[PDB]
Amino acid sequence: HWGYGKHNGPEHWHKDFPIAKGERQSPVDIDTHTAKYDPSLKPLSVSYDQATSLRILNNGHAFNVEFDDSQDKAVLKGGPLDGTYRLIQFHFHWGSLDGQGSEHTVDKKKYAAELNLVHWNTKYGDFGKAVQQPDGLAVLGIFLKVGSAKPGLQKVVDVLDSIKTKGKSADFTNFDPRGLLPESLDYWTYPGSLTTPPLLECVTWIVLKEPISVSSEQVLKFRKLNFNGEGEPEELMVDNWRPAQPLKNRQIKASFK
């Protein structure tokens, strides 16, 4: 089974998932100087006031906070998107040290972590069908840098002890994802893919320009999770990020100049 270790890491994925070498793989490095400001890009529309979180789960490679997506409760639209996208879950990628952890990079600069809010296009009926379409998913990428604590992230940090190992989950209701958004919604957008197998090229990436700050103590808590299941040898869950992939035939657009 794939992972992030020396023998089953990103460089090995192509053997079981040939699309790892495809034309629109993520993440990528965002070169702020060659990104084209596109005046036709609309402002993002994030509607999370009716969001219903259900639970948090350690899936062996990250932890996902899942939401009820049976109705248009938490949606994303506008920006470079056509149609409505429902939020299904959010997760993070982090490093063993503060100088690494993000998947996307800005001018080769790596951040301590990266938050991804995953949404699927309602036109397709369910998440499973959406991943098979070129415009099936819309993922919001938000960078985390170490500085002052992020109040809204604390409820997530405090629950991590109960989902230490792979397979564990915990009820996680009434969490408001609006507390994780930076103040500005300026962004870069490009056509890409899922960053973990099956690596399907069904994602319209929306990476926010402005990072959020989290405390050293907060990021430290992420590093206490385990890739392993209970009772097995302990492998700390750190560096669960895939390196930048070649841009190829793609243009990165910016909503700001």
Which residue numbers are catalytic?
Answer: 61
| Residues at the interface with Zn ion (CB under 5 A) | 116
40 is written with which tokens? 């036709």
Give 61 or 221: the residue with its C-beta nearer to Zn ion: 61
**Cβ 256 to Zn ion shortest distance, Å:** 24
Residue showing the smallest CB distance to Zn ion in the complex: 116
Torsions phi, psi for 28 (to 5 deg):
-140, 165
Which residue, 116 or 218, has its beta carbon nearer to Zn ion?
116
CA distances from 209 to 106, 112, 141, 145, 185 (A): 9, 15, 9, 13, 7
Complex with Zn ion: residue 53 or 116, whichever CB lies closer: 116
Smallest gap from residue 17 Cβ to Zn ion (A): 16
Shortest reach from residue 37's CB to Zn ion, in Å: 26
Under DSSP, the state recorded for 163 is G
Judged on CB neighbours under 10 Å (0-12, 13-18, 19+), 196 is buried
Contacts of residue 162, defined as CB under 8 A and 6 or more positions apart, other chains included, come to 168, 170
